[PDB]
Scaffold this motif. Structure first.
Motif, mmCIF file in Angstrom:
data_model
loop_
_atom_site.group_PDB
_atom_site.id
_atom_site.type_symbol
_atom_site.label_atom_id
_atom_site.label_comp_id
_atom_site.label_asym_id
_atom_site.label_seq_id
_atom_site.Cartn_x
_atom_site.Cartn_y
_atom_site.Cartn_z
ATOM 1 N N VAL A 62 0.801 -1.231 0.000
ATOM 2 C CA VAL A 62 0.000 0.000 0.000
ATOM 3 C C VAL A 62 0.829 1.273 0.000
ATOM 4 O O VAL A 62 0.287 2.365 -0.071
ATOM 5 C CB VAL A 62 -0.964 0.073 1.193
ATOM 6 C CG1 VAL A 62 -1.956 -1.079 1.149
ATOM 7 C CG2 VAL A 62 -0.191 0.094 2.494
ATOM 8 N N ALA A 63 2.142 1.142 0.096
ATOM 9 C CA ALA A 63 3.014 2.310 0.074
ATOM 10 C C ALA A 63 3.086 2.875 -1.346
ATOM 11 O O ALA A 63 3.536 4.005 -1.558
ATOM 12 C CB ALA A 63 4.396 1.925 0.541
ATOM 13 N N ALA A 64 2.672 2.053 -2.311
ATOM 14 C CA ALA A 64 2.667 2.412 -3.719
ATOM 15 C C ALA A 64 1.656 3.488 -3.985
ATOM 16 O O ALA A 64 1.755 4.186 -4.985
ATOM 17 C CB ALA A 64 2.332 1.213 -4.560
ATOM 18 N N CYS A 65 0.671 3.610 -3.100
ATOM 19 C CA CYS A 65 -0.382 4.605 -3.257
ATOM 20 C C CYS A 65 0.164 6.026 -3.143
ATOM 21 O O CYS A 65 -0.436 6.985 -3.634
ATOM 22 C CB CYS A 65 -1.486 4.354 -2.236
ATOM 23 S SG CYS A 65 -2.161 2.655 -2.264
ATOM 24 N N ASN A 66 1.326 6.146 -2.512
ATOM 25 C CA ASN A 66 1.984 7.441 -2.343
ATOM 26 C C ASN A 66 2.940 7.749 -3.501
ATOM 27 O O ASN A 66 3.460 8.858 -3.587
ATOM 28 C CB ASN A 66 2.778 7.488 -1.023
ATOM 29 C CG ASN A 66 1.899 7.331 0.208
ATOM 30 O OD1 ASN A 66 1.923 6.301 0.875
ATOM 31 N ND2 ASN A 66 1.126 8.354 0.512
ATOM 32 N N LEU A 67 3.188 6.776 -4.376
ATOM 33 C CA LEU A 67 4.099 6.969 -5.498
ATOM 34 C C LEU A 67 3.500 7.795 -6.626
ATOM 35 O O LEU A 67 2.288 7.809 -6.822
ATOM 36 C CB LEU A 67 4.511 5.615 -6.057
ATOM 37 C CG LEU A 67 5.345 4.748 -5.129
ATOM 38 C CD1 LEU A 67 5.511 3.383 -5.731
ATOM 39 C CD2 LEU A 67 6.686 5.408 -4.906
#
Ligand SMILES: *[C@@H]1O[C@H](CO)[C@@H](O)[C@H](O)[C@H]1NC(C)=O
Length: 110
Positions: free
Chosen positions: A55-60
């Motif tokens: 879910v850290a990809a949502c900040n990419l």
């Protein structure tokens, strides 16, 4: 596996493969020898991403990349707070790329 660094193996039958890079939160390529590797080895970026993405990809940032074999995929627009559609070029992108609106919603909330 997703946590493991890539492994080319001892063989010499070099091929381009994908490995999930948890630092860049992107699936990248590497020359695989044809034998003896680890699980962080995928044939397509789709597989790699659906397998290793977090879910850290949502900040990419939404990255089109430098290639032109355009495909329209989904990505999370952090400013609007919604899953939008964009044309991915086919190479050198990152994890904020989903293959269905549902998947994008599942990962980044709705
Ligand atoms: C993984 O990504 C980071 C950030 O882009 C980079 O510094 C590092 O070299 C990458 N790892 C490999 C094995 O390429």
């Amino acid at each position: 596996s997703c946590q493991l660094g890539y492994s080319a193996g001892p063989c010499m039958g070099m091929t381009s493969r994908y490995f999930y890079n948890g630092t860049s939160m992107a699936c990248e390529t590497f020359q695989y020898g044809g034998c003896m590797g680890n699980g962080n080895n995928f044939v397509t970026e789709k597989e790699c991403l659906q397998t290793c993405r977090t879910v850290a990809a949502c900040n990419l940032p939404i990255v089109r990349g430098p290639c032109r074999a355009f495909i329209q995929l989904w990505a999370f627009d952090a400013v609007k707070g919604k899953c939008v559609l964009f044309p991915y070029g086919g190479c050198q992108g990152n994890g904020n790329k989903f293959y269905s609106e549902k998947e994008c919603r599942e990962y980044c909330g709705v």
